Write a protein that binds this ligand. Sequence first.
Ligand code: O13
Ligand code: CA
Length: 223
Amino acid sequence: IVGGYTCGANTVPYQVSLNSGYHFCGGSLINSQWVVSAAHCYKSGIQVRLGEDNINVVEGNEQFISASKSIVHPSYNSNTLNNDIMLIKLKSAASLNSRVASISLPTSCASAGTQCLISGWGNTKSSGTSYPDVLKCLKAPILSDSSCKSAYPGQITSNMFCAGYLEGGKDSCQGDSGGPVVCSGKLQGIVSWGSGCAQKNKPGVYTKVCNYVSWIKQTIASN
Ligand SMILES: CN1CCC[C@@H](O/N=C/c2ccc(C(=N)N)cc2)C1
Ligand SMILES: [Ca+2]
């Protein structure tokens, strides 16, 4: 996260870190056994880390649970990033309390102008590279589809939306991938892609989660 703020320990209780020896992606806990992330975060040997603040220090509220299976969206295209969404099942159910909690799926799509909270342990610099140890947060509005398409000609599908600031300086970044965009207590987006980070006229592009609620529910129901 570039241009954001320190969230505060366990203030984002649905935020997970995906770990394969090191943090490599965020995700969102949607029930005791399932995490939603980006398909571009797919890899084998994922351990899900819940209750994290400092990802380099054991602080007392962590749950580390290995993934038993990953399900990349059937229509994911890694070249265009269309359908950039993946489900991860935990080997055992997480213990849910105030610091580790699921986030609700949306029942309808959000609108341009809605304020959302974007979070993760990604790069904090728009030019260089600095990775934080504690969770960073950014409040950002959903942008109109027209301005999103204008920023990224020929690249924005019906399964994507832009959020952030066309002036630059405030954005998600590398390492935030797969993490949440939460708007009025609903998971509306997943950190997907962008040109660099926090660049002028290049806002963050997010997977449009409301399009996938049917698929998520039916997948969970049978797996
Ligand atoms: C570190 N890796 C490995 C995975 C592939 C790629 O992930 N990049 C994600 C990204 C980039 C930019 C933005 C943004 N500006 N909002 C948001 C997300 C680079
Ligand atoms: Ca920790």
